[PDB]
């Protein structure tokens, strides 16, 4: 996934090093819990950034790209194995890639 962000349009009013250094974050959420609680049974690859609104992507397949020791076990947990393992944050251009 290739998520694009603002082009210095509104981020010009907020620059007080308040988690500004924090990159977008992804998490896998089960639909078992929703504001409406109607239907459910699949996962979502949620992606979040402070100002912008959350985003989700349905994952019917039980498992895809779930690799096996890709790198050589280096321990900077960041947030979780998922984020360090397979995400890139082009902060200079504001492009978040996830795979």
């Amino acid at each position: 996934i290739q998520v694009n962000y603002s082009s210095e349009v509104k981020e010009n009013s907020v620059d007080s090093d308040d988690k500004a250094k924090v990159p977008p974050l992804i998490r896998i959420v089960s639909g078992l819990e929703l504001s409406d609680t109607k239907q459910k049974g699949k996962k979502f690859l949620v992606i979040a950034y402070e100002p912008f609104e959350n985003i989700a992507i349905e994952l019917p397949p039980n498992e895809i790209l779930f690799s096996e020791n890709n790198d050589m076990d280096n321990n900077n947990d960041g947030v979780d194995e998922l984020n360090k393992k397979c995400t890139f944050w082009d902060a200079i251009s504001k492009l978040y890639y996830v795979q």
């Binding site: 250094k21 924090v22 974050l25 998490r27 900077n76 960041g78 947030v79």
Partner: protein, 103 residues
């Protein structure tokens, strides 16, 4: 190779006069030398190359007569300068912490 070559060439000329490039920019009008502005990232590396060339102009007409002993002494002193500042590489887990909090 192209970018490298143009950077290093405009750097070669820019190292002697600094007037030939400021004229070239107004004469041609090409998005090729867009690295001349400090905006373009590569610009920085440019500032390096030029400096380096500027340096070669320093001792032109002078030979370097460093001996083995001396070279060794120098390298030993350079290693001591790198060991002088060893209390500055212990600040990075902080950002991670922030991330964990927000997540």
């Amino acid at each position: 190779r192209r970018d490298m070559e143009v950077i290093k060439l405009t750097a070669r000329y820019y190292a002697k006069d600094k007037s030939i490039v400021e004229q070239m920019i107004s004469k041609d009008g090409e998005a090729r030398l867009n690295f001349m502005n400090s905006s373009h990232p590569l610009h920085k590396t440019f500032t390096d190359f030029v400096a380096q060339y500027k340096r070669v102009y320093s001792f032109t007409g002078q030979e370097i007569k460093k001996s083995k002993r001396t070279i060794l002494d120098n390298c030993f002193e350079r290693t001591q300068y790198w060991e002088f500042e060893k209390d500055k590489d212990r600040e990075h887990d902080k950002l991670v912490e922030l991330c964990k909090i927000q997540f």
